[PDB]
Design a protein around this ligand. Structure first.
Ligand SMILES: [Mg+2]
Ligand SMILES: [Mg+2]
Ligand SMILES: [Mg+2]
Ligand SMILES: [Mg+2]
Ligand SMILES: [Mg+2]
Ligand SMILES: [Mg+2]
Ligand SMILES: [Mg+2]
Ligand SMILES: [Mg+2]
Ligand SMILES: [Mg+2]
Ligand SMILES: [Mg+2]
Ligand SMILES: [Mg+2]
Ligand SMILES: [Mg+2]
Ligand SMILES: [Mg+2]
Ligand SMILES: [Mg+2]
Ligand SMILES: [Mg+2]
Ligand SMILES: [Mg+2]
Ligand SMILES: [Mg+2]
Ligand SMILES: [Mg+2]
Ligand SMILES: [Mg+2]
Ligand SMILES: [Mg+2]
Lengths: 47, 102, 109, 199, 117
RNA sequence: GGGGAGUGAAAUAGAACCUGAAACCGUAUGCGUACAAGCAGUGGGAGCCUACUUGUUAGGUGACUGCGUACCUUUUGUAU
């Protein structure tokens, strides 16, 4: 049945969204920290 | 006719036929319960107290029902620090009825 | 009991409360006299509503005009017309032109 | 083995039919097939494609309002979506071995659950839906998938108007139809066709 | 697939405002002031579950001291007299006996005196 | 502009017309407030009113009383 089968446990993850809520863990910042070059749009250190 | 029985680490002012809510104990509904931890027994004006405990005195009770009462909320909020946490709780209890004070 | 409404009246809601509370709970015999000599604009509108309410009881029912007592009077707020008014140094401010809904209710009890 | 309705075993290969059922592989195969059938037809509008919004509404300082740079900004009402999506393809790369292994896995559960009905031959004489309905009433099947070595014209013109019956081919079947339909109707000409295609 | 959030936010706003009812002024009818009144109320509710045991303990001690001073002892000496033996009656069921069962409280106090402590 | 009478299944579908919430503004009944000082709540709690199955049960008020200087961001640090 198409209504029954699923993937194996651990094969699929949920793509955690930064910036939603505060219990999610990535709230209000998205894992960027605080002021600095690596906290803003296009904040890419050159390789 | 009033006694002082220790049930759940605390004691209560128990009379002959009073309903009482007590913390949950491993026993089914309707079964009889005996308390051998009575601390003072009084009957009219004749009052006696236990040396560590009153000897020979018993209080017979039976379980009326079980359940959970009065859901309370827990909020651990920290101002200005980006932290808040919520939790619920319902403590179990056991309504008992008192039959006689031995 | 019977009621009468005036949905859409030029006078604003706040100004008409001070006349409504003056007659809420009186007899129609002196309610018409208080508004017949009141100095406010709301008195003319409210007496026109009250006489229509009395006429409704007289015609649609067999209630005499003597036993009627004005029971419930409340003035709500209706649509407000928005228009601008020029002011100093180029700034223009918005002016609301308010209205009200007057509901006079008389009872023969 | 696959007992045909004419009371004759056939002795299929045991690698295709009668194998371990790895459900994760089947889930991946059906997800990839169902995503590949989707046409990507979506076009929102960024802040660059919305008409207008060229100049600053007001000065940087001295106005008292918030710092606005263009009318057509995502924060503004009539502005464009901040992450407007151009049309794109939805196609997952499924390996040729992986696709065939999913067929071999699902065809085993079709035998185990007795969803697979094998017949000596299924063919209609003239195009007529009620004739095919009567033909299927002989087997007592409803909402059946008909798989044949070659889709005849008469058989194809029939069953299009029929509600729950669909006709496919061995090189036209998919992982989705084999699981969706309640019963699968194969022919002895088709079970041999799967031998060289799957194993 | 556009999702409009005008039906699920109302449920949460009404849920907060239901708990925030009975408060003065804007605290029970505007969401942005009601949420603070709920968070602060929950914090006070959490702290007062701890403080309740302290406040009742302080009241029972005060009542037992008042009941004992009428008999001829002090609370500090009364607890010592009880602890020379093991009478093991809690403050909750000593303040109840101090008020209602005055004869039983006197019968406890005389035995505490007899303990000589 | 209303009160009737009629149409319609339904006019609180009456044209400013399906549903029609929130801010906002009123009218009714219950309770508390004019000797009492502050993030307006929380723990306790008298009296009153409504409800019952007639109160070691239910709901609304909360006199009084201990603690208690809102949320977000920036910070070594904020009621600030
Ligand atoms: Mg963290
Ligand atoms: Mg920041
Ligand atoms: Mg820094
Ligand atoms: Mg950094
Ligand atoms: Mg000019
Ligand atoms: Mg204004
Ligand atoms: Mg442009
Ligand atoms: Mg330019
Ligand atoms: Mg647009
Ligand atoms: Mg290929
Ligand atoms: Mg009719
Ligand atoms: Mg309606
Ligand atoms: Mg309607
Ligand atoms: Mg409208
Ligand atoms: Mg409709
Ligand atoms: Mg409407
Ligand atoms: Mg008011
Ligand atoms: Mg003051
Ligand atoms: Mg925020
Ligand atoms: Mg500084």
């Amino acid at each position: 049945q198409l209504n029954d089968l699923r993937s194996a446990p651990g094969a699929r993850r949920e793509k955690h969204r930064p910036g939603r809520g505060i219990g999610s863990g990535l709230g209000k910042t998205g894992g960027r920290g605080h002021k600095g070059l690596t906290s803003r749009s296009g904040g890419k250190v050159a390789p | 006719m009033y006694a002082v029985i220790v049930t759940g680490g605390k004691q209560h002012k128990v009379t002959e036929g009073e309903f009482l809510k007590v913390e949950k104990l491993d026993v089914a509904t309707g079964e009889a319960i005996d308390f051998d931890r009575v601390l003072l027994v009084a009957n009219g004006e004749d009052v006696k107290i236990g040396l560590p405990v009153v000897e020979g005195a018993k209080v017979t009770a039976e379980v009326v029902s079980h359940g959970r009462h009065d859901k309370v909320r827990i909020i651990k909020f920290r101002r200005r620090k980006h932290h808040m946490k919520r939790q619920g709780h319902r403590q179990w209890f056991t309504e008992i009825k008192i039959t006689g004070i031995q | 009991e019977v009621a009468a409404k005036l949905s859409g009246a030029r006078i604003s809601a706040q100004k008409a409360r001070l006349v409504a509370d003056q007659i809420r709970g009186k007899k129609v015999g002196e309610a018409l006299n208080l508004l017949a000599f009141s100095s406010k604009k709301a008195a003319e509108i409210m007496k026109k509503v009250l006489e229509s309410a009395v006429a409704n009881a007289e015609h649609n029912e067999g209630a005499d005009v003597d036993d009627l007592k004005v029971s419930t009077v409340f003035v709500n707020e209706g649509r407000s017309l928005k228009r601008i008014m020029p002011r100093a140094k180029g700034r223009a401010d918005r002016i609301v032109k308010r209205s009200c809904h007057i509901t006079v209710k008389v009872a023969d009890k | 083995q696959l007992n045909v309705n004419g009371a004759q075993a056939i002795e299929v290969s045991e690698r295709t039919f009668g194998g371990e059922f790895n459900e994760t592989l089947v889930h991946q195969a059906v997800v990839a097939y169902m995503a590949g059938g989707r046409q990507g037809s979506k076009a929102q509008k960024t802040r660059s494609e919305v008409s207008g919004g060229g100049k600053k509404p007001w000065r940087q300082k001295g106005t008292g309002r918030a710092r606005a740079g263009t009318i057509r900004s995502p924060i503004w009402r009539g502005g464009g979506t901040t992450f407007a999506a151009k049309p794109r393809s939805h196609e997952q790369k499924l390996n040729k071995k992986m696709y065939r292994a999913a067929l071999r896995s699902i065809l085993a559960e079709l035998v185990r659950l007795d969803r697979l009905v094998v017949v000596a031959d299924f063919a209609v004489d003239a195009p007529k839906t009620k004739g095919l309905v009567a033909k299927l009433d002989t087997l007592g099947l409803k909402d059946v998938l008909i798989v044949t070595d070659g889709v005849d014209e008469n058989l194809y013109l029939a069953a299009r108007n029929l509600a729950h019956v669909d006709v496919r081919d061995v090189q036209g079947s998919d992982p989705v139809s084999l699981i969706a339909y309640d019963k699968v109707l194969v022919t002895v000409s088709a079970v041999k066709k799967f031998e060289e295609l799957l194993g | 697939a556009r999702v409009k959030r005008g039906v699920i936010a109302r449920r949460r706003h009404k849920k907060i405002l239901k708990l925030a009812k009975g408060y003065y002024g804007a605290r029970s009818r505007v969401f942005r002031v009601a949420k603070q009144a709920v968070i602060k109320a929950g914090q006070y509710a959490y702290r007062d579950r701890r403080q309740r045991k302290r406040q009742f303990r302080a009241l029972w001690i005060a009542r037992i001291n008042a009941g004992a001073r009428q008999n001829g002892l002090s609370y500090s000496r009364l607890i010592a007299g009880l602890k020379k033996a093991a009478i093991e009656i809690d403050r909750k069921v000593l303040a109840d006996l101090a008020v209602n069962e005055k004869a039983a409280f006197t019968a406890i106090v005389e035995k505490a005196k007899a303990s000589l402590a």
